[PDB]
Design a protein around this ligand. Sequence first.
Ligand SMILES: CN(Cc1cnc2nc(N)nc(N)c2n1)c1ccc(C(=O)N[C@@H](CCC(=O)O)C(=O)O)cc1
Ligand SMILES: Nc1ncnc2c1ncn2[C@@H]1O[C@H](COP(=O)(O)OP(=O)(O)OP(=O)(O)O)[C@@H](O)[C@H]1O
Ligand SMILES: Nc1ncnc2c1ncn2[C@@H]1O[C@H](COP(=O)(O)OP(=O)(O)OP(=O)(O)O)[C@@H](O)[C@H]1O
Ligand SMILES: [Mg+2]
Ligand SMILES: [Mg+2]
Lengths: 352, 353, 111, 111, 100, 46, 178, 192
Amino acid sequence: ALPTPHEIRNHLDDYVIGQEQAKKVLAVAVYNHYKRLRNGDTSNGVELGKSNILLIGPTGSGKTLLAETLARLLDVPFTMADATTLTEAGYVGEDVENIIQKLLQKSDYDVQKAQRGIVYIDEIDKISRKSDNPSITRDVSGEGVQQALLKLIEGTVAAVPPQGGRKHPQQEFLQVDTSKILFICGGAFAGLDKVISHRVETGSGIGFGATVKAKSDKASEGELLAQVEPEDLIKFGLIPEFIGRLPVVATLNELSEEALIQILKEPKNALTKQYQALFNLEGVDLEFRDEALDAIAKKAMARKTGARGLRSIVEAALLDTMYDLPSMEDVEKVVIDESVIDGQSEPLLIYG
Amino acid sequence: SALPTPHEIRNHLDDYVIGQEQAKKVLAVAVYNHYKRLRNGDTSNGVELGKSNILLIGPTGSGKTLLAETLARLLDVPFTMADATTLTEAGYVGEDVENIIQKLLQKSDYDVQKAQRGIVYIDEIDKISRKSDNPSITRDVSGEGVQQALLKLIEGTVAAVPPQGGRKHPQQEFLQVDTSKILFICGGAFAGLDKVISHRVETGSGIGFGATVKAKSDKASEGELLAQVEPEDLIKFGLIPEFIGRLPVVATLNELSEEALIQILKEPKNALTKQYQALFNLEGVDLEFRDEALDAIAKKAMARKTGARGLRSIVEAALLDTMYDLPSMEDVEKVVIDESVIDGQSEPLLIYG
Amino acid sequence: LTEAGYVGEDVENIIQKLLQKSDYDVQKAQRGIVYIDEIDKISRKSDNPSITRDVSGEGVQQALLKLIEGTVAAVPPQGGRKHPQQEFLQVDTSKILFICGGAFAGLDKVI
Amino acid sequence: LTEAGYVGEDVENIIQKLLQKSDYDVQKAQRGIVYIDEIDKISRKSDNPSITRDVSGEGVQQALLKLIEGTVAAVPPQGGRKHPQQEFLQVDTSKILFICGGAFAGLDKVI
Amino acid sequence: LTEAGYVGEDVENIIQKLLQKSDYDVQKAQRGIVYIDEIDKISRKGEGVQQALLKLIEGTVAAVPPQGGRKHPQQEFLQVDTSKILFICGGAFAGLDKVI
Amino acid sequence: LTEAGYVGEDVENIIQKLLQKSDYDVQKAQRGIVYIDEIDKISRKS
Amino acid sequence: MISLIAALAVDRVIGMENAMPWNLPADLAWFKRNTLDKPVIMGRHTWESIGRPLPGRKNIILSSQPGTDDRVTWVKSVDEAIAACGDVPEIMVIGGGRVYEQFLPKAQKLYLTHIDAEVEGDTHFPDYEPDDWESVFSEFHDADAQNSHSYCFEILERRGSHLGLIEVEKPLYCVEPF
Amino acid sequence: LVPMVIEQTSRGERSFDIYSRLLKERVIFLTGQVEDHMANLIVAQMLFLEAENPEKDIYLYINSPGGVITAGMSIYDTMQFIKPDVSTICMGQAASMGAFLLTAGAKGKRFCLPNSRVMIHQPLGGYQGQATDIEIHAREILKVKGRMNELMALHTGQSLEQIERDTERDRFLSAPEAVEYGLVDSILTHRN
Ligand SMILES: CN(Cc1cnc2nc(N)nc(N)c2n1)c1ccc(C(=O)N[C@@H](CCC(=O)O)C(=O)O)cc1
Ligand SMILES: Nc1ncnc2c1ncn2[C@@H]1O[C@H](COP(=O)(O)OP(=O)(O)OP(=O)(O)O)[C@@H](O)[C@H]1O
Ligand SMILES: Nc1ncnc2c1ncn2[C@@H]1O[C@H](COP(=O)(O)OP(=O)(O)OP(=O)(O)O)[C@@H](O)[C@H]1O
Ligand SMILES: [Mg+2]
Ligand SMILES: [Mg+2]
């Protein structure tokens, strides 16, 4: 039988760490989509609709990771896109219809399979117009792409170019309905926190009755992002029509030191495991002390780049080691301690 | 012919659309007036009557597209929906307005008569408004370039009929059914027009004791401003004056109210409440929506400013947690949603069974 | 380089160059190295308000985010012998090491 | 000349004019001399803070850093009898002398 | 007219109009008499527009967009030497009388 | 109306609109009149 | 969705009426490959050079005169010809100069084959500048036994490119009591 | 000399005087003797702020020792006329006009620093001339006293009789004592 949201969440926890809301939203969406496909006979007068998600989270949170993780377990055709390449129709840039073409290729030209798929339009925050104010020039890559997608999210018949997908000998426009295709958008929306603060926090001024926080008690990006409303997204530069087609708005939370520590070893393809593979394929063991992981997390948080910061800190700590060790002989293991992460000491190589 | 009257079709449009009384009348009167000329063609009348091309201007989630779709169901003439965001100037790689007529022929079943009696709903007409202030280097291949092409179709051109269905033989059956006898309905939300209209009707404010200072709540909504729209406002928005002139009747929708939103939740054939109940019953659980919750949901949706679409957001959120654990837990018969759940202070009670 | 939909170049031509060197061998090109010089000239003029699209600055940064990390680029099938008539070659950029470079004149003051 | 992606001209035109005089022979064009007049008009107007993007000034200076030194430029399709368009003639500007003349009105005071 | 990089019509455009009147010919255009006008009012505090024209008037080859009679068959953009065109630049210098 | 045989509307269309009106007779065509309107809009203050 | 597949030679000397001055088999292969299973609008002059009906294609000769054959579709106007193709996803124009000149303004793609051989043809392809034609596919071959001279292929799509703006600022001016 | 400060905005940095900078934050200063010239200046500021945002409160600081009554009745009428609530903060001293303009603030938005002093007395005047004119001027000053006494009773909550018995002679009230009469509502001691 179909898998339950709990089961799906488990598969999404092997790779992601610390995003409970996004995992539930995506799980029910997939669950609903699965039953909306199984129940194709429509044994009710109602014509069951679809809800599109809009992942709004900070950098290095797991937006793209979740999308990739989903494609591993699901069976229906899944595709990924990039809003930076898409442009309005009639320009050198890519066309929105190309998305369906890529979905058809993964569906093996089975329109029925493609007609019920899941799309992931990434970098949806880059097509946001400068502001709600009118655009003096044609925003080919901005508004243009938004206005072009409006029909695709609610549903329409797209004329994919002939001889597409798997079918090579075809000379007739194939038709695919976009009314049952779950479009999961996603962006970083850098600068939205300020817009939200201007609404959720007012009174800031000079005087005895004004408000001052000193940035210690001020709300964090995650806290502010969890209060996002359509009015804010409009100011950020998303036309109201586009927001309407994205009812569900799931917000990710800025990873914490505790979460970063778990991401270094718990995930399926955790950072630590990646490096151990390198040292191991050459013939040397690698291990990280628990105290080291804690130190790395503190440094990464200061970089303000999310989980990406970890890779930088790790590469530096083992830079010299990875430069001289390939020539070293009679070495079997390396040990990274807290001292190495701060530079006071150098990794102790166990000779043998 | 002309069996249904404007009142009749209005009663048919109310089954799917809740509200927009003036819009329904305009769409009804125009459709009936255009149909009467179609009954007899020229009606052996010397004077030439003007067309009734409609211009639907309403907020997001008001029912613009819904009206066109439901109207097509009760109509018999061919109806083809076109999106103005995919149409480009002639020659470029994007679609051309000419294929709109071709699509109509497919729906018309290649019947020249039916073809010249169809209705063409051109959605998103507000996305082609020329904005670039004297570029002088590039081409508006998605703006003014398309507005001029549309003028030709609504003001007359040839629509040569090829024998698409019948096996193409060396025979020319093209009689050129002029497109002037086609009712063009152009929709669009015209986001920003309210500001334009405000300036023209702006009373003007001062600083003294005799000035007109009004609070934000004391101002007028886009619905009220849109109702007072005039052709001059559409030109400032970026529409050719000749283009708007071809569309004499403008139907202005009004932002849905709490009452209208409450009705949309249960009255419509495929309302949200019924949609969620269907999937909840597909699993084997009954869904019950208290009337108190319905008004609460409407209050929140009114603030999202996304029209009827806001309803799906509020509902999906409230049931997120439930829909996550419900498919796994057993011994559950019914679920009841109360006002407290919507606010977020309570958890939906379950009728264990 | 310039944002998509503008007269300038695009971030996909970089793969074309890499392809030519690899002799249009997608497998070889997928495991290549790239060096983007002058990466300090596409910097965003943060002091200006976000009122215009920096097709030369921030526009190019937003386009490389998925390239430097990994995507499926669509390059024109151009070359001496190209079997796909119009089936744009798909190249994965998840194994292509990018080595940016810039002079960053003025960064010393910021620090 | 202006930065890429704008209404003005591009720095690659300079190499196109050199082909018109070289009978569209890249080999010969790669061993020619150039003279860029009015090089004092592409200088920052004491705009060290870099408030906005000087597409006509600093922007042009940032585009010549590799043309004056050497790079494989993408010459516009053609201005002669070349039939194809995508050819995008590739010329190496690493053996092309580059003279630059200006008036530098005001430099006398600075000195 | 305006400098390069701006929305304002470029100086090269004047060469286009000149060739059109020439009926797609070089000999005639080479023996043509262009007449710039309203030279005043583009002076200092303007300077940029006067810098571009400063070269055209004293000889410069310019790419003539190939459009017109048979879309100008010549594939070399019908270049034309601007060192033989008599530039009769006029204008009503309002105020010069006082300066003098 | 826009630049003749360039970006925008083609002015040549106007001389063709009256060509059929003149039954493809150059004589009658020359005797025709072209009523241009809304010229105050395209006037500069480009 | 019209196309104008041709075999343009130096200085765009199509030479369609007069028998092909090169007879390159490869050029015909490119033609065949990109024109099979789709309608092929042509001209009466071009139809007199091939003679036999092209197999697998909906031949549509645009001849003002009445139809002389019954194995190919016959049209007598440009507007009806495009309609006569139907709703096919891509149309190919193979007619001579007159045909090309009439369909080019409404053409989206161009399947050009640039032959290097120089001939004094009387008919020529229309002029097409390159800024508005964004190439997609290009192939370069070399002269061989069957192909007297070299032959290059190319495909283009009409697509527009936008340009940035001046990015002007709004200066402020302060006023004091005196 | 008034120091000049800079304010960073999206358009750029602008230099304004300290008082003008605070005006942008809806802060009006009432310092020194009250007269027609300074009264009109405050009236203009109140009207200007109302147009900018008729829903945001206005703060009026009061460090004045008193002044002309007529000058202070214009400010009072202007505060009661405009829609936004006008908050009043006593800073150091508040005499008859200052205290009358301190209790006239919006209910719930009146403040008095911990070491501030408030003094309330009856109107002062005088006239030299014929007996007939003295009577005319005497009756008018007695109407202003009754009128001002009634307005204070309305804004403080005390009975008119008490106000008459407490304003006959100078009455000094500390911040804690003002809260018990009604001239102010709360006392600001720290940010939080
Ligand atoms: C005279 N002529 C016109 C001709 C020739 N080459 C072209 N080449 C191109 N690229 N485009 C054209 N328009 C074109 N037209 C010809 C000559 C032969 C065939 C022909 O016999 N075609 C075969 C293919 C060749 C074969 O196998 O015999 C077919 O099946 O269509 C067609 C057109
Ligand atoms: N919660 C997490 N668990 C595991 N890995 C994570 C997590 N968050 C980020 N990562 C790491 O970050 C990378 C994924 O980046 P992510 O999907 O967050 O893109 P993004 O930064 O959100 O996109 P953008 O750059 O547009 O903001 C992966 O390499 C992964 O190792
Ligand atoms: N008056 C109404 N009665 C019933 N349902 C409505 C009404 N208005 C909106 N809806 C709901 O909104 C959805 C359709 O919205 P619609 O397409 O009419 O908005 P729109 O005005 O076309 O938006 P846009 O201006 O962005 O195109 C349907 O799911 C429908 O249930
Ligand atoms: Mg990402
Ligand atoms: Mg709609």
